[PDB]
Write a protein that holds these residues in place. Structure first.
Motif, mmCIF file in Angstrom:
data_model
loop_
_atom_site.group_PDB
_atom_site.id
_atom_site.type_symbol
_atom_site.label_atom_id
_atom_site.label_comp_id
_atom_site.label_asym_id
_atom_site.label_seq_id
_atom_site.Cartn_x
_atom_site.Cartn_y
_atom_site.Cartn_z
ATOM 1 N N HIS A 163 0.985 -1.405 0.124
ATOM 2 C CA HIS A 163 0.156 0.001 0.061
ATOM 3 C C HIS A 163 0.716 1.223 -0.073
ATOM 4 N N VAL A 164 2.198 1.255 -0.248
ATOM 5 C CA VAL A 164 2.846 2.489 -0.024
ATOM 6 C C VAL A 164 4.005 2.565 -1.397
ATOM 7 N N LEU A 207 4.623 10.380 -8.050
ATOM 8 C CA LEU A 207 3.219 10.665 -7.489
ATOM 9 C C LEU A 207 2.308 9.894 -8.579
ATOM 10 N N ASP A 208 2.757 10.268 -9.866
ATOM 11 C CA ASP A 208 2.130 9.710 -11.078
ATOM 12 C C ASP A 208 2.030 7.936 -11.054
ATOM 13 N N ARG A 209 2.972 7.412 -10.269
ATOM 14 C CA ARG A 209 3.048 5.869 -10.223
ATOM 15 C C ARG A 209 2.254 5.650 -8.994
ATOM 16 N N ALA A 210 2.378 6.296 -7.823
ATOM 17 C CA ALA A 210 1.270 6.283 -6.725
ATOM 18 C C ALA A 210 -0.073 6.168 -7.085
ATOM 19 N N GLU A 211 -0.387 7.085 -7.799
ATOM 20 C CA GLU A 211 -1.714 7.412 -8.389
ATOM 21 C C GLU A 211 -2.269 6.610 -9.299
ATOM 22 N N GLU A 259 -3.721 0.049 -5.226
ATOM 23 C CA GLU A 259 -3.697 -0.442 -4.042
ATOM 24 C C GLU A 259 -2.773 0.601 -3.138
ATOM 25 N N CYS A 260 -2.069 1.423 -3.960
ATOM 26 C CA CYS A 260 -1.129 2.703 -3.232
ATOM 27 C C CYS A 260 -2.019 3.680 -2.654
#
Lengths: 229, 228, 230
Positions: free
Chosen positions: C10-11, C37-41, C45-46
């Motif tokens: 989740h991170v 942030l593009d990858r996290a978005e 599950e992140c």
């Protein structure tokens, strides 16, 4: 079981009771608090509207619009009334119940009291609570509570002024308050509150926008899905 | 009036009075303005040190237009205005401390807004006090009229530091402050003025509201009784 | 890229690393943070973008880039995930802005926060709109005027730090217990609504960058900045 009113020297006590112990802000509770403020204002001797819960619960906010409008109007009256609204917290304050304490002139709480914004769990934002909560605590404590949904202890809430004072007995703290408060003319309290309205950046437009966003959010598919279940 | 002492990088403005109330008279407000003029013309002066005497910092006004204008200068002047509190600060005296860049106090210091007792609101104090403490500490002080200890004032930044000796704290802060160009102090302060929601229009509102309240029936009655 | 990315349950962990140890925000680092942030978005599950430093430094600010820095902080305020700045050591100037713009600031006891910009004839123009929102006016003002660093414990007194802990990764794992129960659409709605709860706007960023670009070209800044870099 609903709002029990008791008259004491210079005080109108408004005790939130409920059949389920949740002390939700139903239209009935909001009208009863509204009529308590009417009674308190009509008494030239009444200096304080003492707002309290029972059985370890202060208030858990609105139960699941018309409710939001009267909640916002009631919090606005707290901000203008020429008497001191004192929220005496002894236990759980959640959601709208946090806004009801935050809207008071003073928050006096016991050490066991907890304050939380669990709204995000049901796909909601506490739109109606936030303008008055942010005025009291600043932006970051209010934000961190909304985002985390975790309760905060009274001693913690006292660090960012959501609680004005943590005490063993809030009723004794209200009696202490009366010593200085009975010396003030109600017209001065009214003028003091009117001037403080202009000392912050929120307006009547903020209330309108809060209600619009709350009703939009409660109709959204995620809030819809979570509230049903 | 105002006793003035030149020290290394510091102009010390000590408020003194016969009654020990250290009230902000038009003459005391005029002298503080002149002290700031002296502080600004000295290229080596980094601090205007404002202090009281005899256990009293300042107990407010004895007028309101000069008081507002002096606090406004505190927020603009290209030097650090440091209020050194060692005792009582009440009403207008809380505003004079709150408008300073830094408030340094002794433990025995107390801060109060007793205005409501005489039918008044501290109109001139609140724009600058609310910026320093946030809304709720300012509001609780004004509603209750009860003094707050320096330690309690430090919790909501009405006091920046509680210390045994404020003159020693001003000498400590000179270590970093002497390294800064006055033009950077002026630019920092100007920019920070845009970082809050209050304007010059807040000053005229405050003055209009106070002048209406001071002629109100409750204020007229209570103030006549205080002075007679 | 000056930024190490690691995927955890989740991170998304964004670790600022640099050979000079200053963890400066260069065009390359700000671009890497925007891509992170593009990858996290893009990962459903992140839930958390975990931003941290390395070897005793969180971030010491900028190496234009000011617009990129302001745009990245604005994203932090709207992104439908929790941005958590995990501070373990030095946060200076722009580095304070990068932490203060996060949803939560979690720090170790040895951490320090400072605004030394007045030393080089600057004002931390880009930092102050999000810093003042987090701490109020006076803590942010005293920090910039004094230039003196503040310990994590003292920064927690005015909410520049949300929590002082022995281990910020352990505190992020604790946050996940409640965060994973929230829908990302709700986080985004909450953050958008909180945007309407403060007096700052998109106009504040453009003002900030205009003021900073004026000050960096002013005579005192030009002289002291020249002195420093030479």
């Amino acid at each position: 079981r609903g709002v029990r009113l008791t008259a004491e020297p210079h005080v109108l006590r408004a005790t939130l009771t409920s059949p389920d112990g949740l002390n939700s802000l139903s239209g009935a509770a909001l009208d009863a608090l509204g009529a308590a403020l009417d009674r308190a204002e009509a008494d030239p001797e009444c200096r304080v509207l003492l707002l309290e819960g029972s059985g370890g619960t202060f208030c858990t906010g609105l139960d699941f619009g018309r409710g939001g409008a009267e909640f916002l109007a009631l919090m606005r009256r707290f901000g203008e009334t020429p008497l001191a609204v004192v929220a005496c917290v002894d236990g759980r304050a959640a959601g709208g119940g946090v806004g009801l304490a935050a809207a008071a002139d003073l928050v006096i709480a016991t050490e066991r009291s907890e304050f939380s914004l669990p709204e995000a769990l049901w796909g909601l934002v506490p739109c109606c609570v936030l303008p008055v909560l942010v005025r009291r605590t600043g932006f970051q404590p209010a934000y961190a509570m909304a985002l985390s949904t975790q309760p905060v202890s009274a001693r913690r809430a006292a660090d960012f002024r959501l609680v004005d004072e943590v005490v063993p007995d809030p009723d004794a703290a209200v009696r202490r308050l009366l010593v200085r408060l009975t010396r003030l003319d109600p017209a001065t309290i009214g003028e003091l509150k009117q001037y403080f309205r202009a000392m912050w950046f929120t307006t009547e437009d903020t209330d309108a926008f809060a209600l619009r966003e709350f009703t939009r959010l409660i109709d959204s598919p995620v809030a819809r899905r979570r509230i049903t279940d």
